[PDB]
Amino acid sequence: FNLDVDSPAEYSGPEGSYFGFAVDFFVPSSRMFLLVGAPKANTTQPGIVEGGQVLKCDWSSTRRCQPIEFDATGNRDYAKDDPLEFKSHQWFGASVRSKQDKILACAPLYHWRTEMKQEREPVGTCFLQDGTKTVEYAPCRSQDIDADGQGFCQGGFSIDFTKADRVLLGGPGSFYWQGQLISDQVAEIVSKYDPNVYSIKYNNQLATRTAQAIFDDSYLGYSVAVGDFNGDGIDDFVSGVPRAARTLGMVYIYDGKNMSSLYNFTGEQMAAYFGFSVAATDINGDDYADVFIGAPLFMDRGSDGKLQEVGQVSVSLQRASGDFQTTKLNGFEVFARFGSAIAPLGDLDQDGFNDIAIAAPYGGEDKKGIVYIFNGRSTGLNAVPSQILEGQWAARSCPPSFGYSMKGATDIDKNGYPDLIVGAFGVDRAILYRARPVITVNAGLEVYPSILNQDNKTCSLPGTALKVSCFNVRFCLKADGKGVLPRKLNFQVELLLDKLKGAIRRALFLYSRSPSHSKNMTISRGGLMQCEELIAYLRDESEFRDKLTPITIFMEYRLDYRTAADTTGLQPILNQFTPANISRQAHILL
Amino acid sequence: DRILTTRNGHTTSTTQSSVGVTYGYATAEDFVSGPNTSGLETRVAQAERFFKTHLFDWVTSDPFGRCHLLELPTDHKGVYGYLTDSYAYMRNGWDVEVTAVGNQFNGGCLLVAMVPELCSIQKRELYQLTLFPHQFINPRTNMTAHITVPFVGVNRYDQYKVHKPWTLVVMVVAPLTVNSEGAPQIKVYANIAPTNVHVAGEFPSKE
Amino acid sequence: TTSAGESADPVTATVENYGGETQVQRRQHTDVSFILDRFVKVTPKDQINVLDLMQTPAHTLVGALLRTATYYFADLEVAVKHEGNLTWVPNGAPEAALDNTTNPTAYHKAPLTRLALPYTAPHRVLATVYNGNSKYGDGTVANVRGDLQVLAQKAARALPTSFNYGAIKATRVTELLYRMKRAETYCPRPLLAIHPDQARHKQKIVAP
Amino acid sequence: GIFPVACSDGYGGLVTTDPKTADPAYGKVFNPPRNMLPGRFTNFLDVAEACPTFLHFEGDVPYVTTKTDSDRVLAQFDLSLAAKHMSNTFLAGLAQYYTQYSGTINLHFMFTGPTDAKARYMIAYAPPGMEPPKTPEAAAHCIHAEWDTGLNSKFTFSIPYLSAADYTYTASDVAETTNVQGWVCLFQITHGKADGDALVVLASAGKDFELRLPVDARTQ
Amino acid sequence: SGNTGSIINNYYMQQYQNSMDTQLGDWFSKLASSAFSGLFGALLA
Ligand SMILES: [Ca+2]
Ligand SMILES: [Mg+2]
């Protein structure tokens, strides 16, 4: 609820290159780097155009996006006068998952001919960068070939990293479009790979082979997720099956230790990609991952009879063992695919729990896109959104779909709150929304005494010799919030008296002789509760009429966005579900 | 001068338009007393009778080569098909008899053929179906074709649940040409009969 | 000769019916035991080759002329050009018995080693086409498959390896040749010559 | 001493059609018995002589249709075993694996019309040397034969073997396009109400038909 | 007898050369020799 929509970090790319299909954070473990992969960008290999590259956008100082390609080798050969690999239009940049220093730039649409016959099998290959080493990881490239093998496996579709340095790869088209999730550690990638050997086969290859006949054309591994789902600490290998049981959708959560099934789910609507985009993160508070299943092609049962394609995201909460609670989260606008750009946010505001961002690509005005922010709480996950986002540039032939590639759980603007890389491949634009420093503001209004006698006569009205009833108004202000931001918060305190009295107000101050008062109170963040006390008296008996309406004091303060910028130049924001104005009452006896 | 009424067992079949019976591949049966059965075979004389079946409806829109292939033995729901589910090894010949009754004012002809082990044919292969035991039917001359063949096979006794040696084939050589005075649509029937079956090896009962 | 047109008994209206006479005709070159016992090339695999006669091609002489018969009996002698040692194995032994040398190996004598094998099949007479062919069965497990699983012309392939004469295994066979002698054939099948697109199939005949 | 021989040169190579039999390696094999098993043929001509097989006409059909116009040529095909009309016949199936033949070729002519349609036909053999005849008047001066459709509905006409040489090539020459072995013409002379009715034809080996010198067609 | 052309006797006996056949206790040559010829009706010269 603190995304910088005013002046975000704009990132562009080449024309017709789909700049914003696979983005990820990168930290040279300071400095930060963005990873925006363009699948149809110009490559440095001769004779190959629109192949794909990984542009690393520099956010520090000035935005410096540099097109980077790891293994830039040309089309290799095997027999004679026949290219072994066809990198032309390979769409290099469909899934680029990174972890600290490792950059996993996968490519499922990488073609490779058969070692026994001249063909063209899209087997997919990944280019991994371990710190400063450039290696290639492609488990779906060995003895297995077309049909009864891994020819259409497209290794590098659903990739993710765990906590024990285990690369999780998942190809839906493995073995007659069934699927296979091969996870191999980086030690076997940097120590077991050889560019001279074409049949790459690792030792500890934990995956799932063929099964029966009903599992054909199921896309086993369309979305992956990491976390604990059985109780062992090691992150498991979640697999999404969109085409399970006459096209319904089931999620097969495999163990991340010896490859074993744990729990199975059930879809909602037939043909809806029940498992297109998943995100495993804590949302309840128990240090357990909670997979939130996406559903782009879902049609909610409306009241007009005709169904509307709005999408659905199921929010599952894991307790101690594996009791996942499903919470139906319906979409919004029609033709929005609510459940495609799902990315965990983590400690977005340091409120004790983690948050998550779910953006609607094909939704929004003019088919642009609206990024829905879902902040966590003590119970579970909020259903209603908190901030509505819009697009910037327009599109050409491909639909815009603002908000497709996005990650999180990694600080990038150096302040403690992770931002959101909203990468849109339709408009070829990657816009980075920065997280504004959330300020936990705690106000206060102590108007004593409570009861107000009409004939009390305590103070003395200056300028005349007629006593009137008076009361003390002591309003306190306090600010407390984590992050890197100037503590000198210039709050614009607006003092208002008698909100009900439309008519003539009965309560006015003494130092200003006016009901509405303007005060500039600049307090400090994290220090002490800076309070202020003043005296406010009541009008004379021969002025007002009603003697039963309580005095409702309404104070409305607003942080002046001027000197609140530092280093990054970002304006902080207040806490969610916390109004910047308060109002109390004062009874008047008769 | 003509004896033109056949019978097998207690069922007869009289036709008055028989051009003649064609004995295919042999006039007499093989030695039924094999060494691969240790003398535990026996003849079932009660399997020898006809049983009728329907093949297709030869109409005027059928071009050259509308063939029909039914594998013998087919589903016999009588005495003969009881032996298929009660004995493992059995052998027999066949004496088929197809009927294509129109009148003597239709035209065209359809070839009838008993052919062993028939699968995966071409329509270019149909020009040489004459090599098998065959007998033409045209309505200008006859109505029936009566072919008789012995047990052929890779080995002496057969497992009919996993193997079908013969295949009755009728294909149409000239199309049916009706006239102002012919019959519009003729229907091809057939009554098939085994000859001298010999079963060996009793199955256990299904109970 | 006017005949009964549908009885399908053989009729030979000879050339004497319009004057003239017939000559003495000799048919040695069309005998079924003379035309089949000559060497034919088949494509080999690298090491293990079952000695089935229906892996002879359909364009060659005694492969397209062996498929004229439904049932055939013939003793096989092979001639194989190889390197290493070539062990023949009889019908129905386990394929792990190809490595053992007690089975009839032939040591390498340059250039090739021809050797006469007996009919080792259990059946009285081998065959070419089975009905119904490919019936585990009928058909193993699913298996499907996709789209080309229904429309496919790969069902006329036999599965029981009992119509084989056995298997030979060497280090690398290069060219192995079949011929079949004392050949008896039964129950003829149709034989096809290739289809002309012209008025007559004119090919370039040999000429000085 | 030992018996001296001379290991002669030029002899002893592997010939693929030789009458040398290979040395045995595995003896004492007794086959299962096969005696009096049905359907045995000995020579390939006896299958070709006892079993006639259809021809090929325009439209991939074996039958020829009667013609209700002034032109009376039912079919006119050149006489070779590599012809277009003879192609699907079994007789030209095994004559694709030889070089040269001699003897008669029987043609069988079955009429498949109704009982009220009557017609009569003729078939003539035009020897090579000039153009084949296009009318039944001009083809009366060949070695011809006529028949009409009645009770016995099949007619068998044995093509004579006329040639200079004693054997004629079963493969028509690739370059030479005159077809100097001969034509065979079959006509209709008249027909009574035989429109749309067929004449299915067949071909068989003759009484004195014998082939010679086998080679490998190799699906050419 | 086949495609043999040797007038000498074989070296290996009969049973180390072929597979011996066993009796237990042809067609198309009889079919092609029963072929009808001549005419069907009364011919003239
Ligand atoms: Ca398709
Ligand atoms: Mg389909």
Automatic annotation (TrEMBL), chain B:
<comment type="function">
    <text>Mediates self-processing of the polyprotein by a translational effect termed 'ribosome skipping'. Mechanistically, 2A-mediated cleavage occurs between the C-terminal glycine and the proline of the downstream protein 2B. In the case of foot-and-mouth disease virus, the 2A oligopeptide is post-translationally 'trimmed' from the C-terminus of the upstream protein 1D by 3C proteinase.</text>
</comment>
<protein>
    <recommendedName>
        <fullName>Genome polyprotein</fullName>
    </recommendedName>
</protein>
<comment type="subunit">
    <text>Interacts with RNA-dependent RNA polymerase; this interaction allows 3B-1 to binds 2 polymerases and act as a primer. It also allows the recruitment of the RNA-dependent RNA polymerase to host membranes.</text>
</comment>
<comment type="similarity">
    <text>Belongs to the picornaviruses polyprotein family.</text>
</comment>
<comment type="function">
    <text>Plays an essential role in the virus replication cycle by acting as a viroporin. Creates a pore in the host endoplasmic reticulum and as a consequence releases Ca2+ in the cytoplasm of infected cell. In turn, high levels of cytoplasmic calcium may trigger membrane trafficking and transport of viral ER-associated proteins to viroplasms, sites of viral genome replication.</text>
</comment>
<comment type="subunit">
    <text>Interacts with RNA-dependent RNA polymerase; this interaction allows 3B-3 to act as a primer.</text>
</comment>
Automatic annotation (TrEMBL), chain D:
<comment type="function">
    <text>Lies on the inner surface of the capsid shell. After binding to the host receptor, the capsid undergoes conformational changes. Capsid protein VP4 is released, capsid protein VP1 N-terminus is externalized, and together, they shape a pore in the host membrane through which the viral genome is translocated into the host cell cytoplasm. After genome has been released, the channel shrinks.</text>
</comment>
<protein>
    <recommendedName>
        <fullName>Genome polyprotein</fullName>
    </recommendedName>
</protein>
<feature type="domain" description="Picornavirus capsid">
    <location>
        <begin position="32"/>
        <end position="186"/>
    </location>
</feature>
From TrEMBL, chain E:
<comment type="subunit">
    <text>Interacts with host DCTN3.</text>
</comment>
<protein>
    <recommendedName>
        <fullName>Genome polyprotein</fullName>
    </recommendedName>
</protein>
<comment type="similarity">
    <text>Belongs to the picornaviruses polyprotein family.</text>
</comment>
<comment type="function">
    <text>Lies on the inner surface of the capsid shell. After binding to the host receptor, the capsid undergoes conformational changes. Capsid protein VP4 is released, capsid protein VP1 N-terminus is externalized, and together, they shape a pore in the host membrane through which the viral genome is translocated into the host cell cytoplasm. After genome has been released, the channel shrinks.</text>
</comment>
<comment type="function">
    <text>Mediates self-processing of the polyprotein by a translational effect termed 'ribosome skipping'. Mechanistically, 2A-mediated cleavage occurs between the C-terminal glycine and the proline of the downstream protein 2B. In the case of foot-and-mouth disease virus, the 2A oligopeptide is post-translationally 'trimmed' from the C-terminus of the upstream protein 1D by 3C proteinase.</text>
</comment>
<comment type="subunit">
    <text>Interacts with RNA-dependent RNA polymerase; this interaction allows 3B-3 to act as a primer.</text>
</comment>
